């Protein structure tokens, strides 16, 4: 049983509720996260951060290992998907995901169209973790839904790109507080 | 890879779709803009704000330097024309651009019968750049189309005029949100 | 009887319902009309014209001399009553009124203080009509609550004095329009 | 003669009342101003914005060049002062004032252990004024105490600094309302 991930209130995070994922730097640290495109690509949706700090942008909700547990608690593998306000034109889900390797960037991008539970092998991609901090709660991408599955370790950190502030992998990542949408 | 301008949905603008502009501010702060009339001036349209909150007045399209970048993005130039949903009698076009000066008030008006596209500095006073406001977003003129051009460089504000809400160049910009047309 | 006065929305005023007294103008027109006090006296307070268009002011209610007309209209003696939403220090009503003239500016202000109701000598500073106008709606202090009583007969312009924009009785009245407050 | 600032009662400023002073945008936009600390830095206090605007903060008091004028005016120089709502480990005062320029920043800040009064060269940093936004008022820094002095003149924004919300000199300034304390 590992500590509960807590919201601005204090309150425990509870699976299937919706929540604002706002920078946890207050002064210049941006928005929440939501949902963009690339020029080359409108669908699926990759995952952005909104510049301005008014923009809450879209909530969340998490999904737990077991679908019995309903506290969100650090390191332990979670589902995250964008609960959109209004249906939106890709056909692709709005589940996180790692992408594959951007040999144009050398990033490893989050992306989304990712896929809710069934663990192991066939939906590692989908699996990101929640690591507490000094500034505030940090995304880490390590499943362990697959013993013998070679992955990728490492947090989500924050990086422009054409315009836009993308989650990729990183060595540091960026600390965020969870706010919920009521 | 400048930041994208994003819509009341979220969504970044696209060059070529329809957009209101609404005032970030509502209430007394007035609804959408629209084409207007001066009391002795039918032809070209001036630029206007509806009163009423309520009022998405009429879309605009926005048009990039680039025919090819289909993202509208803050601090580039960019032209704005009206959805001509006007009666016949105008020839002129709906795209906006800044006046010459008007002694009668001191303001650089914006008014329409601009040109699309060309940029340089035969079109220098059809260009506008979309910036970031303390909320939503404010239009600045500060052409950067013609490098040995001087040029005036301001930001849009809201002026009385003829008994109607009009846009002209001012120290501080009025904000707007952009709603899906 | 006489010409029924209308609010924005194309209805008719009714007695006893609430409407902000807005410029008429728009651009640079300034905002509704409010209350507001004096270096030299926090009580009564005077009635002022905001200077922003954002500030709609307080609304009032009108008062017709018969309590059976509910219609608001043209020519016609009514009491005008600001109704705040919070409850007031001064204990001076908030009924419009005619001023004692003011030897300092020599003008006939507009403040409060007023009495509803009892037409006649008594209460004859508190009556005002609204009048039409081509750019909309002016008052007029003219009151005909009482035959043999001399009395003032003017239009209500706007002046600004000390900071403030105050309506006094002028040649040509200042135009407003009517909003539900609602 | 300068219009008279209004809060959010639509009441005008009184020099000496207790006032929040709260950002006119809510949301991410934050709530109101209060003391605070950099982490390596107890005395002075800084002055900060609360990220939750529901935190009205604590109130200031405002101080005019002349004690005998009590209203609070668009455009004229004054102090502002918090309401000591803090521990007694600094002997420093909540005057706001501007600091020496920031070399590891860039910024003008704001910070307190500013005067009162005496206004001229030697108090030329503590010395704000209120003006009209797009909504609500700006503070601008653009003393006139001292015709002769060479100064900044420049609205207050706000900037992130050691984690938290700042304010600072800026092209554009961040609009506040007032809120009686009381
Ligand atoms: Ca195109
Ligand atoms: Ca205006
Ligand atoms: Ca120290
Ligand atoms: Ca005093
Ligand atoms: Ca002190
Ligand atoms: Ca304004």
Chains 1, 3, 4 share one sequence.
Request: with cysteine; net charge negative.
């Amino acid at each position: 049983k590992n500590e509960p991930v807590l919201d601005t209130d204090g309150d425990e995070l509870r699976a299937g509720e919706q929540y604002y994922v706002v920078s946890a730097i207050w002064g210049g640290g941006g928005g929440g996260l939501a949902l963009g495109r690339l020029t080359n690509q409108q669908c699926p949706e990759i995952v952005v951060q909104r510049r301005s700090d008014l923009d809450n942008g879209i909530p969340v909700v998490f999904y737990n290992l077991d679908s019995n547990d309903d506290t969100v608690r650090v390191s332990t593998d979670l589902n995250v998907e964008f609960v959109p306000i209004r249906d939106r034109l890709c056909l692709t889900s709005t589940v996180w995901k790692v992408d594959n390797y951007d040999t144009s960037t050398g990033k490893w991008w989050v992306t989304t169209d990712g896929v809710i539970g069934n663990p192991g092998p066939h939906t590692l991609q989908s699996w990101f973790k929640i690591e507490s901090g000094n500034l505030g709660y940090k995304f880490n991408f390590c499943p362990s839904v697959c013993e013998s599955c070679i992955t990728l370790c490492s947090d989500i950190g924050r990086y422009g790109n054409d315009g836009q502030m993308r989650l990729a992998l990183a060595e540091s990542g960026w600390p965020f507080v969870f706010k919920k949408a009521s």
